Amino acid sequence: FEGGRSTTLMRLPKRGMQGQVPGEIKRPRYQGVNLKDLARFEGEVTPELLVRAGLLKKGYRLKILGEGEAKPLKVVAHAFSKSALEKLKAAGGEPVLLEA
Amino acid sequence: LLLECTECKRRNYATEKNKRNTPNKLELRKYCPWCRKHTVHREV
Amino acid sequence: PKMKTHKGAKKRVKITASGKVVAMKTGKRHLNWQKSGKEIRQKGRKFVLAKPEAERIKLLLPY
Amino acid sequence: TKNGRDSQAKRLGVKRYEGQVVRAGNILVRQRGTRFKPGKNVGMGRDFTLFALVDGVVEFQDRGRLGRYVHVRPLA
RNA sequence: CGCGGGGGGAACCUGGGGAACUGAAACAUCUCAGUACCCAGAGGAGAGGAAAGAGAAAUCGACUCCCUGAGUAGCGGCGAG
RNA sequence: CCCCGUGGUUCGUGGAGCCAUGGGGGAAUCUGGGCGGACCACCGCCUAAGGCUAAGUACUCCGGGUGACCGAUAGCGCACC
RNA sequence: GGAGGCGUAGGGAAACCGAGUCCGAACAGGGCGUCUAGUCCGCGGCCGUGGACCCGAAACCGGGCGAGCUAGCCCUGGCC
RNA sequence: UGAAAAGCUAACCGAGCCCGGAGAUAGCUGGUUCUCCCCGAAAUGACUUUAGGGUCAGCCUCAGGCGCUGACUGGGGCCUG
RNA sequence: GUGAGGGCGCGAGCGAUAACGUCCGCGUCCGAGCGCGGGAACAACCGAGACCGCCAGCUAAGGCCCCCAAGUCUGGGCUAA
RNA sequence: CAGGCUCUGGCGACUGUUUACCAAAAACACAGCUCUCUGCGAACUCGUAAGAGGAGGUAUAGGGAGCGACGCUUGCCCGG
RNA sequence: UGAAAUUGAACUGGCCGUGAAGAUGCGGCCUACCCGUGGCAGGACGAAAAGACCCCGUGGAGCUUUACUGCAGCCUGGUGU
RNA sequence: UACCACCCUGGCGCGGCUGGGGGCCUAACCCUCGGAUGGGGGGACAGCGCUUGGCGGGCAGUUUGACUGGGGCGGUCGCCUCCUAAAAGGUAACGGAGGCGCCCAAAGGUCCCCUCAGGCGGGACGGAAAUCCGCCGGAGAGCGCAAGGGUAGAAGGGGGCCUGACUGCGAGGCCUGCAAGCCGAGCAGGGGCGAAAGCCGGGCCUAGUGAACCGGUGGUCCCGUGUGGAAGGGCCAUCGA
Ligand SMILES: [Mg+2]
Ligand SMILES: [Mg+2]
Ligand SMILES: [Mg+2]
Ligand SMILES: [Mg+2]
Ligand SMILES: [Mg+2]
Ligand SMILES: [Mg+2]
Ligand SMILES: [Mg+2]
Ligand SMILES: [Mg+2]
Ligand SMILES: [Mg+2]
Ligand SMILES: [Mg+2]
Ligand SMILES: [Mg+2]
Ligand SMILES: [Mg+2]
Ligand SMILES: [Mg+2]
Ligand SMILES: [Mg+2]
Ligand SMILES: [Mg+2]
Ligand SMILES: [Mg+2]
Ligand SMILES: [Mg+2]
Ligand SMILES: [Mg+2]
Ligand SMILES: [Mg+2]
Ligand SMILES: [Mg+2]
Ligand SMILES: [Mg+2]
Ligand SMILES: [Mg+2]
Ligand SMILES: [Mg+2]
Ligand SMILES: [Mg+2]
Ligand SMILES: [Mg+2]
Ligand SMILES: [Mg+2]
Ligand SMILES: [Mg+2]
Ligand SMILES: [Mg+2]
Ligand SMILES: [Mg+2]
Ligand SMILES: [Mg+2]
Ligand SMILES: [Mg+2]
Ligand SMILES: [Mg+2]
Ligand SMILES: [Mg+2]
Ligand SMILES: [Mg+2]
Ligand SMILES: [Mg+2]
Ligand SMILES: [Mg+2]
Ligand SMILES: [Mg+2]
Ligand SMILES: [Mg+2]
Ligand SMILES: [Mg+2]
Ligand SMILES: [Mg+2]
Ligand SMILES: [Mg+2]
Ligand SMILES: [Mg+2]
Ligand SMILES: [Mg+2]
Ligand SMILES: [Mg+2]
Ligand SMILES: [Mg+2]
Ligand SMILES: [Mg+2]
Ligand SMILES: [Mg+2]
Ligand SMILES: [Mg+2]
Ligand SMILES: [Mg+2]
Ligand SMILES: [Mg+2]
Ligand SMILES: [Mg+2]
Ligand SMILES: [Mg+2]
Ligand SMILES: [Mg+2]
Ligand SMILES: [Mg+2]
Ligand SMILES: [Mg+2]
Ligand SMILES: [Mg+2]
Ligand SMILES: [Mg+2]
Ligand SMILES: [Mg+2]
Ligand SMILES: [Mg+2]
Ligand SMILES: [Mg+2]
Ligand SMILES: [Mg+2]
Ligand SMILES: [Mg+2]
Ligand SMILES: [Mg+2]
Ligand SMILES: [Mg+2]
Ligand SMILES: [Mg+2]
Ligand SMILES: [Mg+2]
Ligand SMILES: [Mg+2]
Ligand SMILES: [Mg+2]
Ligand SMILES: [Mg+2]
Ligand SMILES: [Mg+2]
Ligand SMILES: [Mg+2]
Ligand SMILES: [Mg+2]
Ligand SMILES: [Mg+2]
Ligand SMILES: [Mg+2]
Ligand SMILES: [Mg+2]
Ligand SMILES: [Mg+2]
Ligand SMILES: [Mg+2]
Ligand SMILES: [Mg+2]
Ligand SMILES: [Mg+2]
Ligand SMILES: [Mg+2]
Ligand SMILES: [Mg+2]
Ligand SMILES: [Mg+2]
Ligand SMILES: [Mg+2]
Ligand SMILES: [Mg+2]
Ligand SMILES: [Mg+2]
Ligand SMILES: [Mg+2]
Ligand SMILES: [Mg+2]
Ligand SMILES: [Mg+2]
Ligand SMILES: [Mg+2]
Ligand SMILES: [Mg+2]
Ligand SMILES: [Mg+2]
Ligand SMILES: [Mg+2]
Ligand SMILES: [Mg+2]
Ligand SMILES: [Mg+2]
Ligand SMILES: [Mg+2]
Ligand SMILES: [Mg+2]
Ligand SMILES: [Mg+2]
Ligand SMILES: [Mg+2]
Ligand SMILES: [Mg+2]
Ligand SMILES: [Mg+2]
Ligand SMILES: [Mg+2]
Ligand SMILES: [Mg+2]
Ligand SMILES: [Mg+2]
Ligand SMILES: [Mg+2]
Ligand SMILES: [Mg+2]
Ligand SMILES: [Mg+2]
Ligand SMILES: [Mg+2]
Ligand SMILES: [Mg+2]
Ligand SMILES: [Mg+2]
Ligand SMILES: [Mg+2]
Ligand SMILES: [Mg+2]
Ligand SMILES: [Mg+2]
Ligand SMILES: [Mg+2]
Ligand SMILES: [Mg+2]
Ligand SMILES: [Mg+2]
Ligand SMILES: [Mg+2]
Ligand SMILES: [Mg+2]
Ligand SMILES: [Mg+2]
Ligand SMILES: [Mg+2]
Ligand SMILES: [Mg+2]
Ligand SMILES: [Mg+2]
Ligand SMILES: [Mg+2]
Ligand SMILES: [Mg+2]
Ligand SMILES: [Mg+2]
Ligand SMILES: [Mg+2]
Ligand SMILES: [Mg+2]
Ligand SMILES: [Mg+2]
Ligand SMILES: [Mg+2]
Ligand SMILES: [Mg+2]
Ligand SMILES: [Mg+2]
Ligand SMILES: [Mg+2]
Ligand SMILES: [Mg+2]
Ligand SMILES: [Mg+2]
Ligand SMILES: [Mg+2]
Ligand SMILES: [Mg+2]
Ligand SMILES: [Mg+2]
Ligand SMILES: [Mg+2]
Ligand SMILES: [Mg+2]
Ligand SMILES: [Mg+2]
Ligand SMILES: [Mg+2]
Ligand SMILES: [Mg+2]
Ligand SMILES: [Mg+2]
Ligand SMILES: [Mg+2]
Ligand SMILES: [Mg+2]
Ligand SMILES: [Mg+2]
Ligand SMILES: [Mg+2]
Ligand SMILES: [Mg+2]
Ligand SMILES: [Mg+2]
Ligand SMILES: [Mg+2]
Ligand SMILES: [Mg+2]
Ligand SMILES: [Mg+2]
Ligand SMILES: [Mg+2]
Ligand SMILES: [Mg+2]
Ligand SMILES: [Mg+2]
Ligand SMILES: [Mg+2]
Ligand SMILES: [Mg+2]
Ligand SMILES: [Mg+2]
Ligand SMILES: [Mg+2]
Ligand SMILES: [Mg+2]
Ligand SMILES: [Mg+2]
Ligand SMILES: [Mg+2]
Ligand SMILES: [Mg+2]
Ligand SMILES: [Mg+2]
Ligand SMILES: [Mg+2]
Ligand SMILES: [Mg+2]
Ligand SMILES: [Mg+2]
Ligand SMILES: [Mg+2]
Ligand SMILES: [Mg+2]
Ligand SMILES: [Mg+2]
Ligand SMILES: [Mg+2]
Ligand SMILES: [Mg+2]
Ligand SMILES: [Mg+2]
Ligand SMILES: [Mg+2]
Ligand SMILES: [Mg+2]
Ligand SMILES: [Mg+2]
Ligand SMILES: [Mg+2]
Ligand SMILES: [Mg+2]
Ligand SMILES: [Mg+2]
Ligand SMILES: [Mg+2]
Ligand SMILES: [Mg+2]
Ligand SMILES: [Mg+2]
Ligand SMILES: [Mg+2]
Ligand SMILES: [Mg+2]
Ligand SMILES: [Mg+2]
Ligand SMILES: [Mg+2]
Ligand SMILES: [Mg+2]
Ligand SMILES: [Mg+2]
Ligand SMILES: [Mg+2]
Ligand SMILES: [Mg+2]
Ligand SMILES: [Mg+2]
Ligand SMILES: [Mg+2]
Ligand SMILES: [Mg+2]
Ligand SMILES: [Mg+2]
Ligand SMILES: [Mg+2]
Ligand SMILES: [Mg+2]
Ligand SMILES: [Mg+2]
Ligand SMILES: [Mg+2]
Ligand SMILES: [Mg+2]
Ligand SMILES: [Mg+2]
Ligand SMILES: [Mg+2]
Ligand SMILES: [Mg+2]
Ligand SMILES: [Mg+2]
Ligand SMILES: [Mg+2]
Ligand SMILES: [Mg+2]
Ligand SMILES: [Mg+2]
Ligand SMILES: [Mg+2]
Ligand SMILES: [Mg+2]
Ligand SMILES: [Mg+2]
Ligand SMILES: [Mg+2]
Ligand SMILES: [Mg+2]
Ligand SMILES: [Mg+2]
Ligand SMILES: [Mg+2]
Ligand SMILES: [Mg+2]
Ligand SMILES: [Mg+2]
Ligand SMILES: [Mg+2]
Ligand SMILES: [Mg+2]
Ligand SMILES: [Mg+2]
Ligand SMILES: [Mg+2]
Ligand SMILES: [Mg+2]
Ligand SMILES: [Mg+2]
Ligand SMILES: [Mg+2]
Ligand SMILES: [Mg+2]
Ligand SMILES: [Mg+2]
Ligand SMILES: [Mg+2]
Ligand SMILES: [Mg+2]
Ligand SMILES: [Mg+2]
Ligand SMILES: [Mg+2]
Ligand SMILES: [Mg+2]
Ligand SMILES: [Mg+2]
Ligand SMILES: [Mg+2]
Ligand SMILES: [Mg+2]
Ligand SMILES: [Mg+2]
C-alpha cells in the first residue's frame, strides 16, 4: 500500500491457472535428486534410502538427474533424465519405478 | 473503423483499420501466417 | 501473528531463484487496436523491478 | 485566462561528444530534424536520431553548404 | 392421590435472535463479526459422537481436544481482507 | 428427489456440488436410495428422513501450593466495619 | 518424542523437462537459472498483525433506566 | 408530547440518561524523563480525492567490499544561441 | 529524518522598474552557528566556524575627543550647512 | 390604596398560545371558507400480531390540506 | 469570623529608536529616597472561555430532493390455503 | 384437367394437452345472530404463506474532487508546439501565445522520372488570380492539420509494379523515482520493388491518448477434482473507458 494512487498493482496476473473452486488437483509430484549427491553414498539406492538420509522427504516421486559422476551402483527411481540415464548407463545398473 | 484481417483457407487475424465509406468496401491484402508462410487475408 | 501471503501479489509476480522479482509487461491487452508488431512483441516478455522489487518480496516470504 | 499550457520537455541534443568511445549502436545525437546528417558507420532512425553502427570514436565535421556530419572512426 | 417443574450460580457450554464504531486511508458489496449484547436451556461441564463419513489411497474407519498439515488449498469491489 | 427463496462451508452466483430448509410438485424399500464439486458414462464409497453413550476438552464462585508479582498514589474499587 | 519445517534445482500458465528451461520452425537471438550453500538457539535494529508511544473527540450501536421537572390526555376533588 | 419554538421529555435536547461494543477512529493539537563521545540532514522532483498526509528518488548515518576514482584544478577536443 | 522554508547578491517572469510581496534559476548565510567581534540596539549586512584552561601574545571587520580600548597623529586640499 | 389624555398610520379581526432560562410578536391558535379521502371489518393513525384508536360514531359523520372574524371579490394558462 | 478567579519567577518607571513588524525586561536618553491608605480605569496586547466568524480534516450531526443504493408501505402476475 | 399420393394457405367436425372470460352454488376462509351441532351475509373473492415486477425522502446508509496570493463564484485538470528558461539537460506562476482526442489502401513500400513560390513580358474566352510561351527567379512554395526544426544533392509533384500497415527476435542506448515513452544494427523465416548496389518491421519528424480488474469474439502444444468426456479455466489474438 501507498501513495494512495496505484501501488504498483498496475502490473498484472499472467499467473493464469490461478486456481479453481474445489481447488488443488492432486497429482504425482516428482522431486529431482541430483546423481552427484546420490553418488555420495553407495550400495544400492531406493526412494526410501534417499529420503531416509537427506533428500526427497516423502515428496514420494524420485528422479535422479543432473551432472556429476555415476557410481557403479544400482539405482531404483521414478524417472531418469536423458543425461543422467547415460552417465549411469556407462558405469552401472538402472531400474525404473514400481508403477503406481 | 477498426478491422481484423483473417487469413484465407484458415482463421488467423491481424492488427487492422479499414475506412468504411472511403473507397474501401473491399479488403483482401496479402499477409503472412505462422502456420505455413504467406497468403491472402480477408476483411472479416 | 503469522504474516499472510499477499494473495493479490503472488497472483501476478514471480521471485527469481537469485532473488529478483519478475513480472509481466504492462500495456498489452486493450489500448491495442493497431500497435506496432514491435510493440506487442516486446510487451510479451517479462521483466524486473529494482526498489519496489524489495517492496513485494516482503509481502510473500512464507512463499 | 487560457494560457497555462505547455508540453513536457523532450530533452534532446547531442548525447555523445567528439572524441568519445562508443559501443555497438548506442545513440549519439537526438535532433528535431536534420541539424546533423549521418556519416561513416552512422545511420539514423525515424525521429532523425543518430546512432553508432560500430564501435570506435565519434568525430564531427562541418561541410558548409552540405551540412554538419557525425561519424565513428572505428578501431580494433 | 402420586412423582416432577418453578428460582439462583463467577466464568465456562449449547440453541433462538444479533449490531455499530472501525478497516477498506471516501463509501454502498466486503470487513469488525456471527463478535457485543438480549433470550431460552444444560451442568460439573456443555456440545459432538459410531458414517446415506471422508476422498483417490482398488486406502481410512464414532466423537472430542492438542501438534502439524498451512497462511497451503481456495475465497475476495481478486481490494481491504 | 427436482424447482423457487436463503443459511452453513474456504466458496461473495461463481462451471457450484455437499449439509440445512421457508414455498411448490412429490417417489421408492435393496433391481431401493445418498454421495466421490454442474452434467453423462464407467468404476468406487455409503445406507438418510427415531434415539442414547463414559474418557480425553472448556471455566475458577470455592480450598491448597508457588512466584527474577505489588508493597498502601502500588496491589482487586476495598490490607482499615 | 522425526510427525513436521527450512535447506539440497531451476525454468515454464501449464502438460513438462532439467543444469538447464522458456519464447521460437531455429543447433538466430534473448529472459530467467548452473557452476553449491544452509540451518537451530541467544541478543539487537527495524517491518507486519493486534489499542502497538501516551492522554483527548464531536459521534455511532446494543441492552436497560427516567414523565416525583416539563408536555399532552384520563379519573376524582378543590379554588375564583 | 407540542394553540408549532425543533419547544419539552429530571438545572445545556437538531434526537434524553446509564452501562456496554470501548483502549471507536483522530493523515489534528499536546506531552515523551540519566550522562558523555563521533557524524550530521531537509524544507527539492515525480505521482497522489494529493496539497499541514503519504510512495519512489534526492540529501544524513552505520556495517561489510572496492582502491585514486571525488570535489576543485591544468591541457586538449567536441555541443550551445 | 525531510517533503511549510527564510533573508541577502545576481539573472528573469508576475507586480506598478510598489511591498519584510510573489514565482523560478545560480550562489550564499540563518535554519541547526539567537555562540564570539563589528553594525547603538537587531537570525541571516561586514569579520569569524566556540574541545576545555590561562590576570600571555598578533591580527580581522571596525575603530583610536569623552561615555568607551587605542592618535585631540603627520602632510595637502574642500566644506560654513 | 388610586387611569395621563388626543389625533393619525402599519400588522393581526377578536379572548387565547408560545421559544421553562436573552425573542410574547405582525409568529401559532381560533370561529369561519374551500379543496380532497372515506359506504363502514370506513378512510387514516400505533402495533411483527392479536389488537386498539377512529366510534359503541355512520357523509349535517370521520381523516388530510390550505386559507383564517366580517364586507367586497378572487381573472387567464392544463405544454411540464 | 474570613473567601475567589488569577499566579513561569520578579528587584515590574517616561520618551525615541528597536526588535516577529504595538517593550517594565534590548539601545540610547530622561526621571526616580523606602513602605503603605483612600480613589481612577489608560497599559500589563489585563481575567474568563484550547474563536462561535473564516479556512483546513478524504471529522460529526439535523434537514431537502426529479443525488446513489436500500427498507416500510402500497399495487401486481403466478401459486398454496 | 379420371384416378392415387406427400404436402401448403385458410377454415369446420372428434379426442388428447392446455389457458383465458361470464353466470350460479356452498361447505373452505371472513363477518354476524339473545350459545349455534345451528341460522343469516359474504365467498373461492378477500385474508394469510412462497415467489414476480413495479411505485416508493415515510425511513435508512452514504456520496456531493483538487488547484486556488482566504473560501466561494469563475477558470483550469491529460498530450503537442513556441516563448519565459539566464548559448548542455532541466527549471515555477491563475506568466505570454496557439493546437490534439484525428486522417490516408494511398497520404504506405519500392523503381524510374520530375522541381516551386513568386516578379516582368506575350497571349482568343479568362482576367488582380484559370490554361499557354518566354525570361528572371535557391528556396519566400510544398510537405493532410498547430507550431517549431528540417528540407528541392527531396522529405516536395507524376508514373510502373506492389502490400515489410510482416512473423520469430533483438546487441546497444536515449530518457527516467517507479510504471511507462523512444531510437535501433544485425540474425532466421518468408516476400515486394530494382540491372545491381540495395531498400521495406507504415506515413519528414515531435500530438492524435488510457495501468490493473471484470467480461465478450476467434484461435490453440496446456489444465480438466476417482477415470473418459463435458463445464470451466490457461495461453495467443483482439474487443468494451
Ligand atoms: Mg491483463
Ligand atoms: Mg497455484
Ligand atoms: Mg559415463
Ligand atoms: Mg471487403
Ligand atoms: Mg469484426
Ligand atoms: Mg536461493
Ligand atoms: Mg527458494
Ligand atoms: Mg540469495
Ligand atoms: Mg493494455
Ligand atoms: Mg509472439
Ligand atoms: Mg511453507
Ligand atoms: Mg505553465
Ligand atoms: Mg516544449
Ligand atoms: Mg513545465
Ligand atoms: Mg518549453
Ligand atoms: Mg408417582
Ligand atoms: Mg432442575
Ligand atoms: Mg436451573
Ligand atoms: Mg447461534
Ligand atoms: Mg438463531
Ligand atoms: Mg460509517
Ligand atoms: Mg467518511
Ligand atoms: Mg461474516
Ligand atoms: Mg452466539
Ligand atoms: Mg420456554
Ligand atoms: Mg434457569
Ligand atoms: Mg459429556
Ligand atoms: Mg446429545
Ligand atoms: Mg445406526
Ligand atoms: Mg442432490
Ligand atoms: Mg417458490
Ligand atoms: Mg425467484
Ligand atoms: Mg436451494
Ligand atoms: Mg444466520
Ligand atoms: Mg454462502
Ligand atoms: Mg471465509
Ligand atoms: Mg461467504
Ligand atoms: Mg453456495
Ligand atoms: Mg439438498
Ligand atoms: Mg422445503
Ligand atoms: Mg442427500
Ligand atoms: Mg463423498
Ligand atoms: Mg466428479
Ligand atoms: Mg461415501
Ligand atoms: Mg446410517
Ligand atoms: Mg433408513
Ligand atoms: Mg440410524
Ligand atoms: Mg443414528
Ligand atoms: Mg442422528
Ligand atoms: Mg452427552
Ligand atoms: Mg486445561
Ligand atoms: Mg487461590
Ligand atoms: Mg494459596
Ligand atoms: Mg509462593
Ligand atoms: Mg517474591
Ligand atoms: Mg493510603
Ligand atoms: Mg488504595
Ligand atoms: Mg508510606
Ligand atoms: Mg495517599
Ligand atoms: Mg475481588
Ligand atoms: Mg474482600
Ligand atoms: Mg461501618
Ligand atoms: Mg470491610
Ligand atoms: Mg516454480
Ligand atoms: Mg542460446
Ligand atoms: Mg542482454
Ligand atoms: Mg540461455
Ligand atoms: Mg545470459
Ligand atoms: Mg544455491
Ligand atoms: Mg538469529
Ligand atoms: Mg529479530
Ligand atoms: Mg523493514
Ligand atoms: Mg504480519
Ligand atoms: Mg489508539
Ligand atoms: Mg510498535
Ligand atoms: Mg507495530
Ligand atoms: Mg406530571
Ligand atoms: Mg406546573
Ligand atoms: Mg415548553
Ligand atoms: Mg438525570
Ligand atoms: Mg442552564
Ligand atoms: Mg428539549
Ligand atoms: Mg447527545
Ligand atoms: Mg443523534
Ligand atoms: Mg481514546
Ligand atoms: Mg497517515
Ligand atoms: Mg561535526
Ligand atoms: Mg544547508
Ligand atoms: Mg506535500
Ligand atoms: Mg517515509
Ligand atoms: Mg520519503
Ligand atoms: Mg566503508
Ligand atoms: Mg593503490
Ligand atoms: Mg578526474
Ligand atoms: Mg578542463
Ligand atoms: Mg574544455
Ligand atoms: Mg514545498
Ligand atoms: Mg524557496
Ligand atoms: Mg535552500
Ligand atoms: Mg534562498
Ligand atoms: Mg523585494
Ligand atoms: Mg551552515
Ligand atoms: Mg546577538
Ligand atoms: Mg538596524
Ligand atoms: Mg540565528
Ligand atoms: Mg546575527
Ligand atoms: Mg599588538
Ligand atoms: Mg592594522
Ligand atoms: Mg584596521
Ligand atoms: Mg590633516
Ligand atoms: Mg587637512
Ligand atoms: Mg382609589
Ligand atoms: Mg383607576
Ligand atoms: Mg385629561
Ligand atoms: Mg390602531
Ligand atoms: Mg392577535
Ligand atoms: Mg385582514
Ligand atoms: Mg381573558
Ligand atoms: Mg399549552
Ligand atoms: Mg413564557
Ligand atoms: Mg408559560
Ligand atoms: Mg436553558
Ligand atoms: Mg433556551
Ligand atoms: Mg403578550
Ligand atoms: Mg408560536
Ligand atoms: Mg375549522
Ligand atoms: Mg370566510
Ligand atoms: Mg366520495
Ligand atoms: Mg408508521
Ligand atoms: Mg404496519
Ligand atoms: Mg374496532
Ligand atoms: Mg368505541
Ligand atoms: Mg372533510
Ligand atoms: Mg363585480
Ligand atoms: Mg387563482
Ligand atoms: Mg386576462
Ligand atoms: Mg398546466
Ligand atoms: Mg391534459
Ligand atoms: Mg397533455
Ligand atoms: Mg513604583
Ligand atoms: Mg528602556
Ligand atoms: Mg512595569
Ligand atoms: Mg543587549
Ligand atoms: Mg533601558
Ligand atoms: Mg492603592
Ligand atoms: Mg484597611
Ligand atoms: Mg487599567
Ligand atoms: Mg469602578
Ligand atoms: Mg506590569
Ligand atoms: Mg484593557
Ligand atoms: Mg482552536
Ligand atoms: Mg471526498
Ligand atoms: Mg463524512
Ligand atoms: Mg450524516
Ligand atoms: Mg421521475
Ligand atoms: Mg416526478
Ligand atoms: Mg426495491
Ligand atoms: Mg403478491
Ligand atoms: Mg398475489
Ligand atoms: Mg389469488
Ligand atoms: Mg373429454
Ligand atoms: Mg380441445
Ligand atoms: Mg381434453
Ligand atoms: Mg368458470
Ligand atoms: Mg352469489
Ligand atoms: Mg342463496
Ligand atoms: Mg347462501
Ligand atoms: Mg345450509
Ligand atoms: Mg381456507
Ligand atoms: Mg358454530
Ligand atoms: Mg359452523
Ligand atoms: Mg354459519
Ligand atoms: Mg354461511
Ligand atoms: Mg349468495
Ligand atoms: Mg366476485
Ligand atoms: Mg385468493
Ligand atoms: Mg409515480
Ligand atoms: Mg414519495
Ligand atoms: Mg427505487
Ligand atoms: Mg428513491
Ligand atoms: Mg437521508
Ligand atoms: Mg460503515
Ligand atoms: Mg464519490
Ligand atoms: Mg479545496
Ligand atoms: Mg479565490
Ligand atoms: Mg492575499
Ligand atoms: Mg468552481
Ligand atoms: Mg505522447
Ligand atoms: Mg522547445
Ligand atoms: Mg527558437
Ligand atoms: Mg536551455
Ligand atoms: Mg528554447
Ligand atoms: Mg550565466
Ligand atoms: Mg544555464
Ligand atoms: Mg533574457
Ligand atoms: Mg538552449
Ligand atoms: Mg510573461
Ligand atoms: Mg477513441
Ligand atoms: Mg495507389
Ligand atoms: Mg510562373
Ligand atoms: Mg520581361
Ligand atoms: Mg491580351
Ligand atoms: Mg486570368
Ligand atoms: Mg494576362
Ligand atoms: Mg531553406
Ligand atoms: Mg501550414
Ligand atoms: Mg506546418
Ligand atoms: Mg526551440
Ligand atoms: Mg515548418
Ligand atoms: Mg519552418
Ligand atoms: Mg527553413
Ligand atoms: Mg518552411
Ligand atoms: Mg519522391
Ligand atoms: Mg511520401
Ligand atoms: Mg507509387
Ligand atoms: Mg533494449
Ligand atoms: Mg525504466
Ligand atoms: Mg507516443
Ligand atoms: Mg521522449
Ligand atoms: Mg506524408
Ligand atoms: Mg522531437
Ligand atoms: Mg478494483
Ligand atoms: Mg481473462
Ligand atoms: Mg484446443
Ligand atoms: Mg509454441
Ligand atoms: Mg486430458
Ligand atoms: Mg485436452
Ligand atoms: Mg474430490
Ligand atoms: Mg486417480
Ligand atoms: Mg472427470
Ligand atoms: Mg475450453
Ligand atoms: Mg477457452
Curated annotation (Swiss-Prot), chain A:
Q: Report keywords, A-Z.
A: Ribonucleoprotein, Ribosomal protein, RNA-binding, rRNA-binding
GO biological process terms, semicolon-separated = translation
* Gene Ontology cellular component annotations, sorted alphabetically: cytosolic large ribosomal subunit
Citing just one GO molecular function, the answer is: structural constituent of ribosome
Record flagged with keyword RNA-binding: yes
In terms of superkingdom, the source organism counts as Bacteria
Keyword Transcription regulation listed? The answer is: no
Family of the protein in this entry: Belongs to the universal ribosomal protein uL15 family.
Q: How does it assemble?
A: Part of the 50S ribosomal subunit.
Q: What does this protein do?
A: Binds to the 23S rRNA.
Q: What is this protein called?
A: Large ribosomal subunit protein uL15
- Gene assigned in the entry: rplO
Q: Where the shown chain sits in the full protein?
A: 51 to 150 of 150
Swiss-Prot record, chain B:
Native organism taxonomy: Bacteria, Thermotogati, Deinococcota, Deinococci, Thermales
Write the protein's name: Large ribosomal subunit protein bL33
Q: Which GO terms describe its molecular function?
A: structural constituent of ribosome
Could you tell me the Gene Ontology terms of the biological process aspect for this record? Answer: translation
Source organism superkingdom: Bacteria
The shown residues of the full protein are 9 to 52 of 54
**Position of the signal peptide:** none
Can you list the GO cellular component terms from the UniProt entry?
cytoplasm; ribonucleoprotein complex; ribosome
- The answer, when asked if Transport is one of the entry's keywords, is no
Keywords attached to this Swiss-Prot or TrEMBL record, sorted alphabetically, are: Ribonucleoprotein, Ribosomal protein
Task: Describe the family membership recorded for this protein in Swiss-Prot or TrEMBL.
Answer: Belongs to the bacterial ribosomal protein bL33 family.
Curated annotation (Swiss-Prot), chain C:
Task: Give the family from UniProt.
Answer: Belongs to the bacterial ribosomal protein bL35 family.
Gene Ontology CC terms, in alphabetical order: cytosolic large ribosomal subunit
Q: Does the keyword Ribonucleoprotein feature in the UniProt annotation?
A: yes
Matching PANTHER family, A to Z? 54S RIBOSOMAL PROTEIN BL35M (PTHR33343), LARGE RIBOSOMAL SUBUNIT PROTEIN BL35M (PTHR33343:SF1)
Question: What biological-process GO terms show up in the record?
Answer: translation
Would you tell me the protein name for this molecule?
A: Large ribosomal subunit protein bL35
What species was this sequence derived from? Answer: Thermus thermophilus (strain ATCC BAA-163 / DSM 7039 / HB27)
The keyword Metal-binding belongs to this UniProt entry's keyword annotation: no
**What's an example of a GO molecular-function annotation for this chain?**
structural constituent of ribosome
Q: Which UniProt keywords apply?
A: Ribonucleoprotein, Ribosomal protein
Q: Identify the InterPro entries for this entry.
A: Ribosomal_bL35 (IPR001706), Ribosomal_bL35-like (IPR021137), Ribosomal_bL35_CS (IPR018265), Ribosomal_bL35_sf (IPR037229)
From Swiss-Prot, chain D:
- Classify the source by domain of life: Bacteria
The record, for InterPro entries, names: Ribosomal_bL27, Ribosomal_bL27_CS
Record's keyword terms, sorted: Ribonucleoprotein, Ribosomal protein
SUPFAM superfamilies the UniProt entry points to: Ribosomal L27 protein-like (SSF110324)
Q: Which Pfam families match?
A: Ribosomal_L27 (PF01016)
GO cellular component assignments: cytosolic large ribosomal subunit
Q: Which GO terms describe its molecular function?
A: structural constituent of ribosome
Question: Biological process GO annotation list?
Answer: translation
The record's annotation in Gene3D superfamilies points to: 2.40.50.100
Q: What protein family does this chain belong to?
A: Belongs to the bacterial ribosomal protein bL27 family.
HAMAP family (UniProt xref): Ribosomal_bL27 (MF_00539)
Quote the PANTHER family the UniProt record gives.
Answer: LARGE RIBOSOMAL SUBUNIT PROTEIN BL27M, RIBOSOMAL PROTEIN L27
Q: What is this protein called?
A: Large ribosomal subunit protein bL27
